[PDB]
Design a protein around this ligand. Sequence first.
Ligand SMILES: [Mg+2]
Ligand SMILES: [Mg+2]
Ligand SMILES: [Mg+2]
Ligand SMILES: [Mg+2]
Ligand SMILES: [Mg+2]
Ligand SMILES: [Mg+2]
Ligand SMILES: [Mg+2]
Ligand SMILES: [Mg+2]
Ligand SMILES: [Mg+2]
Ligand SMILES: [Mg+2]
Ligand SMILES: [Mg+2]
Ligand SMILES: [Mg+2]
Ligand SMILES: [Mg+2]
Ligand SMILES: [Mg+2]
Ligand SMILES: [Mg+2]
Ligand SMILES: [Mg+2]
Ligand SMILES: [Mg+2]
Ligand SMILES: [Mg+2]
Ligand SMILES: [Mg+2]
Ligand SMILES: [Mg+2]
Ligand SMILES: [Mg+2]
Ligand SMILES: [Mg+2]
Ligand SMILES: [Mg+2]
Ligand SMILES: [Mg+2]
Ligand SMILES: [Mg+2]
Ligand SMILES: [Mg+2]
Ligand SMILES: [Mg+2]
Ligand SMILES: [Mg+2]
Ligand SMILES: [Mg+2]
Ligand SMILES: [Mg+2]
Ligand SMILES: [Mg+2]
Ligand SMILES: [Mg+2]
Ligand SMILES: [Mg+2]
Ligand SMILES: [Mg+2]
Ligand SMILES: [Mg+2]
Ligand SMILES: [Mg+2]
Ligand SMILES: [Mg+2]
Ligand SMILES: [Mg+2]
Ligand SMILES: [Mg+2]
Ligand SMILES: [Mg+2]
Ligand SMILES: [Mg+2]
Ligand SMILES: [Mg+2]
Ligand SMILES: [Mg+2]
Ligand SMILES: [Mg+2]
Ligand SMILES: [Mg+2]
Ligand SMILES: [Mg+2]
Ligand SMILES: [Mg+2]
Ligand SMILES: [Mg+2]
Ligand SMILES: [Mg+2]
Ligand SMILES: [Mg+2]
Ligand SMILES: [Mg+2]
Ligand SMILES: [Mg+2]
Ligand SMILES: [Mg+2]
Ligand SMILES: [Mg+2]
Ligand SMILES: [Mg+2]
Ligand SMILES: [Mg+2]
Ligand SMILES: [Mg+2]
Ligand SMILES: [Mg+2]
Ligand SMILES: [Mg+2]
Ligand SMILES: [Mg+2]
Ligand SMILES: [Mg+2]
Ligand SMILES: [Mg+2]
Ligand SMILES: [Mg+2]
Ligand SMILES: [Mg+2]
Ligand SMILES: [Mg+2]
Ligand SMILES: [Mg+2]
Ligand SMILES: [Mg+2]
Ligand SMILES: [Mg+2]
Ligand SMILES: [Mg+2]
Ligand SMILES: [Mg+2]
Ligand SMILES: [Mg+2]
Ligand SMILES: [Mg+2]
Ligand SMILES: [Mg+2]
Ligand SMILES: [Mg+2]
Ligand SMILES: [Mg+2]
Ligand SMILES: [Mg+2]
Ligand SMILES: [Mg+2]
Ligand SMILES: [Mg+2]
Ligand SMILES: [Mg+2]
Ligand SMILES: [Mg+2]
Ligand SMILES: [Mg+2]
Ligand SMILES: [Mg+2]
Ligand SMILES: [Mg+2]
Ligand SMILES: [Mg+2]
Ligand SMILES: [Mg+2]
Lengths: 114, 119, 209, 56, 123
Amino acid sequence: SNIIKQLEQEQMKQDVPSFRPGDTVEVKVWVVEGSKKRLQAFEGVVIAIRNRGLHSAFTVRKISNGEGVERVFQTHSPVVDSISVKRRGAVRKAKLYYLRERTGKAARIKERLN
Amino acid sequence: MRHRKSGRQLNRNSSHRQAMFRNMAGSLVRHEIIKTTLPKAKELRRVVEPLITLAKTDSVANRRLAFARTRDNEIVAKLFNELGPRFASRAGGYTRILKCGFRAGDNAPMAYIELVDRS
Amino acid sequence: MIGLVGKKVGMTRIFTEDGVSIPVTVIEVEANRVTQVKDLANDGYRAIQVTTGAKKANRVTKPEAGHFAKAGVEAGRGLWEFRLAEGEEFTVGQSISVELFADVKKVDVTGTSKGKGFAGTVKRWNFRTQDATHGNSLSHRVPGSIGQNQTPGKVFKGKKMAGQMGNERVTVQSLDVVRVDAERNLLLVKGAVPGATGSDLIVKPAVKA
Amino acid sequence: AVQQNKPTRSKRGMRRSHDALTAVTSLSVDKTSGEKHLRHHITADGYYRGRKVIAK
Amino acid sequence: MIQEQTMLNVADNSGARRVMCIKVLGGSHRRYAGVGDIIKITIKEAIPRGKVKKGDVLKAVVVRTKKGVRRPDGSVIRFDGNACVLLNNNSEQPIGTRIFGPVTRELRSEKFMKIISLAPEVL
RNA sequence: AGGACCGAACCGACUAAUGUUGAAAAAUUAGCGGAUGACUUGUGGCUGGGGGUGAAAGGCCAAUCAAACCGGGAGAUAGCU
RNA sequence: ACACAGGUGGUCAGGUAGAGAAUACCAAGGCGCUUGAGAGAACUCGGGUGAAGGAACUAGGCAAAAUGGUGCCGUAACUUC
RNA sequence: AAUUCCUUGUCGGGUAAGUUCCGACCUGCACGAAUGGCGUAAUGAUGGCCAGGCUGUCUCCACCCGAGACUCAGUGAAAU
RNA sequence: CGAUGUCGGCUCAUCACAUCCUGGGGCUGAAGUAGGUCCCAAGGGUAUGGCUGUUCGCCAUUUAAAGUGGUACGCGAGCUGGGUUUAGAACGUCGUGAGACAGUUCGGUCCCUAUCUGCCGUGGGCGCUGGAGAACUGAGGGGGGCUGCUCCUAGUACGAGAGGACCGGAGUGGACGCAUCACUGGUGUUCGGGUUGUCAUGCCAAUGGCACUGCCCGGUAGCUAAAUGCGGAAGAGAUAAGUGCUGAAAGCAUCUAAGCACGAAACUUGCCCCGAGAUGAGUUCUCCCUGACCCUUUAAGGGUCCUGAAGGAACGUUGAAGACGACGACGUUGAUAGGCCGGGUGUGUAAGCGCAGCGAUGCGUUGAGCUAACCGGUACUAAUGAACCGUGAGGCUUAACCU
Ligand SMILES: [Mg+2]
Ligand SMILES: [Mg+2]
Ligand SMILES: [Mg+2]
Ligand SMILES: [Mg+2]
Ligand SMILES: [Mg+2]
Ligand SMILES: [Mg+2]
Ligand SMILES: [Mg+2]
Ligand SMILES: [Mg+2]
Ligand SMILES: [Mg+2]
Ligand SMILES: [Mg+2]
Ligand SMILES: [Mg+2]
Ligand SMILES: [Mg+2]
Ligand SMILES: [Mg+2]
Ligand SMILES: [Mg+2]
Ligand SMILES: [Mg+2]
Ligand SMILES: [Mg+2]
Ligand SMILES: [Mg+2]
Ligand SMILES: [Mg+2]
Ligand SMILES: [Mg+2]
Ligand SMILES: [Mg+2]
Ligand SMILES: [Mg+2]
Ligand SMILES: [Mg+2]
Ligand SMILES: [Mg+2]
Ligand SMILES: [Mg+2]
Ligand SMILES: [Mg+2]
Ligand SMILES: [Mg+2]
Ligand SMILES: [Mg+2]
Ligand SMILES: [Mg+2]
Ligand SMILES: [Mg+2]
Ligand SMILES: [Mg+2]
Ligand SMILES: [Mg+2]
Ligand SMILES: [Mg+2]
Ligand SMILES: [Mg+2]
Ligand SMILES: [Mg+2]
Ligand SMILES: [Mg+2]
Ligand SMILES: [Mg+2]
Ligand SMILES: [Mg+2]
Ligand SMILES: [Mg+2]
Ligand SMILES: [Mg+2]
Ligand SMILES: [Mg+2]
Ligand SMILES: [Mg+2]
Ligand SMILES: [Mg+2]
Ligand SMILES: [Mg+2]
Ligand SMILES: [Mg+2]
Ligand SMILES: [Mg+2]
Ligand SMILES: [Mg+2]
Ligand SMILES: [Mg+2]
Ligand SMILES: [Mg+2]
Ligand SMILES: [Mg+2]
Ligand SMILES: [Mg+2]
Ligand SMILES: [Mg+2]
Ligand SMILES: [Mg+2]
Ligand SMILES: [Mg+2]
Ligand SMILES: [Mg+2]
Ligand SMILES: [Mg+2]
Ligand SMILES: [Mg+2]
Ligand SMILES: [Mg+2]
Ligand SMILES: [Mg+2]
Ligand SMILES: [Mg+2]
Ligand SMILES: [Mg+2]
Ligand SMILES: [Mg+2]
Ligand SMILES: [Mg+2]
Ligand SMILES: [Mg+2]
Ligand SMILES: [Mg+2]
Ligand SMILES: [Mg+2]
Ligand SMILES: [Mg+2]
Ligand SMILES: [Mg+2]
Ligand SMILES: [Mg+2]
Ligand SMILES: [Mg+2]
Ligand SMILES: [Mg+2]
Ligand SMILES: [Mg+2]
Ligand SMILES: [Mg+2]
Ligand SMILES: [Mg+2]
Ligand SMILES: [Mg+2]
Ligand SMILES: [Mg+2]
Ligand SMILES: [Mg+2]
Ligand SMILES: [Mg+2]
Ligand SMILES: [Mg+2]
Ligand SMILES: [Mg+2]
Ligand SMILES: [Mg+2]
Ligand SMILES: [Mg+2]
Ligand SMILES: [Mg+2]
Ligand SMILES: [Mg+2]
Ligand SMILES: [Mg+2]
Ligand SMILES: [Mg+2]
């Protein structure tokens, strides 16, 4: 409705950069440990993007310490602070769920130049 | 339960409904008035009227789309040469339902569905 | 304390500064205007009768339109009634805004739930299904046994059986109110209230505190 | 799954108490041809709300 | 989201490779166990010379789930497998000395301050 | 070469579900076994009831079998209902 | 007993793919199975997909799911070789 | 033990836990040598047990597609 | 005995209290903690596995606890068919034998479309005394009632130490329940794409049909749980066991006889829902009707003509309402549904053309094209002028007022 959209567009963030699935992205989130807010980095491959305006989200997969870690960030949440596209990739799907069984050389994605 | 859903099942499976409305939309373009049952007449508006709106822009691509929906070149020719420019100013609502009583074989509530600019 | 009559606009979320997402339910609350003040001398109890929204003039009936004309107020889409506490009073044509909830902290939201229709005992009363294999003859989601043998030639009252589920008055208690926006007539409560989108809601301050 | 006593014709009449048909309330009359039809249906000659909606 | 009969990988150098949850502790009829939850387990596969032995029965704390754990913004952190760190039965401190793979911020407490200390990465 | 192997026709009937006033007085559906042999099938023949026939289950002998069917003794007899 | 999802011997054997008379789609040819129309509850029937777990179900992995082809590599105990 | 009453014998293995299973023991209620004894490769829509894969079997069900059920019109049973 | 289906499991249960947990007490050979024992208390709660057909039992590991019983050893016109208990076969054993064995072993058809009671839902009729539209009160009925752990009080009381509280407060769980779809997900045979075989559209190109939606990949709305909100209370009243105060009978003593006080998850309330068919049919508010005459058996009488209100119903467009009724929205003075326009979302760069390449193909046009149920708009189509039902001041008897 008009009432919902007015409440949601005033909470959105005006600086979300344009990224596609397959872009190697680097997300800086806020971490409150003890009492000092620090800014932990998270960097992997965008395997899914779900666009719903304020409720928009995206999924980042990385291979951390041998283990694969998926993390579904809420885009307009303030606990994420920066989103930076490190390396943009060339895929032909909207959601890269097949990377959950590809490792090493098989899970490469080529670079979307230009 | 059927909350906020759309489309009538009409006691058919999905491929039969698509092939029945493919035949029936071509039959309505061909004769400009047909007599069918009232649930099938109301559900036919969601098929024919997107085809007529498709026919307002005569491109080669839209001929291929309208052929992919109907699979009859005589209907696609009638859509873009006649019913395209006939309805070129109307903002939708290209057809009209006229309830015509009850079928003698099974008491089915029938209806005439016709194009607006017919008579 | 009295409550107010609103409408379920939908659900959204309020991102706090701390990184917490609060799932909220937007309830628009237009100006509730009173239509009748009830008292002990005439009615035996103390309450007010409010109205909200608008209604088509050709559709409000002459008995109903005469009731608004006595109070001298525009016809609203319904008539609800809130019991008065002691030391609490209102005039007849008085309008009541959403600023009444400016300093409450928890509310109870009463609505009519969604209509599930005729529901079976797996869905309605959370019965266990029987075995889906191992020989079961036509009895996968049936309620099973319903009584005992000859001792009570009879099934007891209130036995959990299939029937109408939902489409009835339910009240969710102690909802945390998040934001009271008087300028655009809104009310944000934490969590999910009953009812579909666009249905009437009765928001009262919480009685269990 | 079957009865133990013959139900009476009185009980039979009480079950058929709701099986009565409802006659049509009033037939609408066309303003041009003046003939009677079902409300919101076309006439037998092919009129509906005045105009001749279908030839014959 | 670990229940009975669930096989888990082992996240430390305690000597086990593959353990099975046999009881989700802390409450009657308790179905599941997320991260930070104590489970009684058995050992199904071990290294030849470890602190633990095949068939031992002991406790464990779940540190990684494939279902994942949710953060108060609404975000969720999923892993590709199920991993737990073995505990002593009584003292309920970890047996191994080196934690493998990441853990989460839900794990840290006064109870498991040692495990997040030894983890290579805390998400 | 094969009472060989895998597998359709064909022959059989292991399991489940349906069906159980059925579509069907034993079937359908999805699987299943054999499938050049002690195989299977058409047509015609022969064996008759204390008899036949039986790779034997008291199986089969016209939807009937610890003695078929039909007619007769016959209105058997019934201290039983 | 039925205009009955059964049973019934012989002959004819197109295309594409395929080892094939399997199977998919078609030709020649023949059909749409003699109640329909709506609606889109529980429940039943026949199916589809499923988070996390993976036999904890159960008398029993019943049923489902899974495996599935060709070529090449490679292949244990035991053995009447 | 297709045989063992006592018996879930005892011991060992397998399992977190095994009245079943497997290996022993012999105290064979009441094995035993062509109403055959003991072995035995291959074979079995055979019996019991274990493991891998697999999964709505299950924790605990959810949704969907169709055929009924439901409503209308036509025909129109049955047991009791 | 002209048939009352049986062990165990499954799925629903329900009651008792001789109480397993939680609650309240008394005594203790009760320091504390933890117990023993008995009294009160049935409000709620009250495991999962291994083995076995098992109930049971043993064992593993839980838990505050894993209560004992009644219910045709509850429950097969609800399910299962492992056990028992048909016909086959075998062992041991008995018998010359046919055969037999609460000895064992392998195999072995579980039917019923609900007339009545009952129960879960949902309607029609009529009533409630003129008719109608609403809002109610609450007689009564139902729901709900569980609890861990940590922290503080406080290492305080207690204790030789070891240990370690009552009372009170805060947090966070398990199980259960209600609601919801904002999140995370599932589904999504009505959206998009990939692709195998084949057939067709004259052919190319491009599509469509069929093959389980052909096989997949994603996915809108909706519905959903595993997702996330919320709930159990506090309080009050009267109490149980119990504890008392004052106090005689009985100069004392004594909780009781007179009088008074305290006392539990039980009881009545408080919370939620239904609820005036509550025939004892209630209350409030508003709206509508202010015509003539005939009749004989003169009465709560019958009829004629005129009149047809408020409202309702029917019909139509329909719905996050729904089996059907019902309920809700709307019917031109109109956004009810469809279409249309715009947006969003999803899918992932359409077709055509051009270029590069021997070609498969790649690139540009191009985040293109298509896009369901969604959002905001828009009378384009369909929601008709009517007709129909409902009437025309509403009994008697007193009483109090009014003139
Ligand atoms: Mg709709
Ligand atoms: Mg039909
Ligand atoms: Mg198809
Ligand atoms: Mg509904
Ligand atoms: Mg079950
Ligand atoms: Mg059966
Ligand atoms: Mg079934
Ligand atoms: Mg019974
Ligand atoms: Mg009785
Ligand atoms: Mg009788
Ligand atoms: Mg009837
Ligand atoms: Mg052979
Ligand atoms: Mg045979
Ligand atoms: Mg078959
Ligand atoms: Mg073969
Ligand atoms: Mg015999
Ligand atoms: Mg015979
Ligand atoms: Mg004879
Ligand atoms: Mg004889
Ligand atoms: Mg004689
Ligand atoms: Mg005689
Ligand atoms: Mg026929
Ligand atoms: Mg051929
Ligand atoms: Mg074939
Ligand atoms: Mg037929
Ligand atoms: Mg259905
Ligand atoms: Mg499947
Ligand atoms: Mg699954
Ligand atoms: Mg998926
Ligand atoms: Mg999975
Ligand atoms: Mg088991
Ligand atoms: Mg079990
Ligand atoms: Mg099987
Ligand atoms: Mg299969
Ligand atoms: Mg013996
Ligand atoms: Mg024995
Ligand atoms: Mg096992
Ligand atoms: Mg042993
Ligand atoms: Mg077993
Ligand atoms: Mg042995
Ligand atoms: Mg012998
Ligand atoms: Mg001998
Ligand atoms: Mg022998
Ligand atoms: Mg009928
Ligand atoms: Mg008897
Ligand atoms: Mg009898
Ligand atoms: Mg007692
Ligand atoms: Mg005590
Ligand atoms: Mg009780
Ligand atoms: Mg109880
Ligand atoms: Mg009670
Ligand atoms: Mg109480
Ligand atoms: Mg047990
Ligand atoms: Mg007894
Ligand atoms: Mg019994
Ligand atoms: Mg019992
Ligand atoms: Mg039984
Ligand atoms: Mg049996
Ligand atoms: Mg025998
Ligand atoms: Mg016997
Ligand atoms: Mg009624
Ligand atoms: Mg009560
Ligand atoms: Mg409590
Ligand atoms: Mg949702
Ligand atoms: Mg949504
Ligand atoms: Mg999804
Ligand atoms: Mg799908
Ligand atoms: Mg969804
Ligand atoms: Mg094709
Ligand atoms: Mg081509
Ligand atoms: Mg075809
Ligand atoms: Mg075909
Ligand atoms: Mg209290
Ligand atoms: Mg005294
Ligand atoms: Mg005294
Ligand atoms: Mg008191
Ligand atoms: Mg307008
Ligand atoms: Mg519209
Ligand atoms: Mg659009
Ligand atoms: Mg997009
Ligand atoms: Mg292009
Ligand atoms: Mg395409
Ligand atoms: Mg580009
Ligand atoms: Mg796009
Ligand atoms: Mg709209």
